[PDB]
Design a protein around this ligand. Sequence first.
Ligand code: MED
Length: 240
Amino acid sequence: EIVFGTTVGDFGDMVKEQIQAELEKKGYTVKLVEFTDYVRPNLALAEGELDINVFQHKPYLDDFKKEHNLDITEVFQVPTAPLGLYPGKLKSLEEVKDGSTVSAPNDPSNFARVLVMLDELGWIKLKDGINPLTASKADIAENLKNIKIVELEAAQLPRSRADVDFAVVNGNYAISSGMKLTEALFQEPSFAYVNWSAVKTADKDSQWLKDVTEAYNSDAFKAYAHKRFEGYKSPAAWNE
Ligand code: MED
């Protein structure tokens, strides 16, 4: 029995609609546990409540496992809903004003993504030569449009659109709140945040993980993903 943990929505649908049957064909049973937050899944994995989770990108994982002393590691990538800047009280990028508010996730690896996006938009200017994966407020050279960044817990970002001019929303929460990726005013161009599964390091060589990895890389899964998850960013290894 393989116990998966995912965030609600797209990553759990992948298990229930495609992966689970592929693994049952090989004699496994599958249990899915879903989470509404980003903090519990790696802790449940490390404590043995999960065998594998699918919810995070590698910058998040690298930071989280180091901070909390978790002996876990990434395995394979999965199709991922991209990060986007979405309309809030203002409906178009050209409407940005001096002092416009932008809501952003408050954890460091996802906050960096917002600063890189704001620099790409020309709303702020980051210093030269920084590490984009750890971009922080100290790396801002000039806040060109005096953007006020409103930092929130990531799950709160869809609801923040009533309170801020623009909202930068993680794809999993955008999808699960009924937002459409095509409604974004600007989508992150990077592929560094295509999400990874994670397991306890002790399990990296297990036969069950080999079978899970094959399930997420099958022709059938790719065909399903391309239809069910249009506009998602693909694993690098799919070589699309
Ligand atoms: C926990 S890392 C952030 C969530 C991830 N699904 C993303 O690519 O936005």
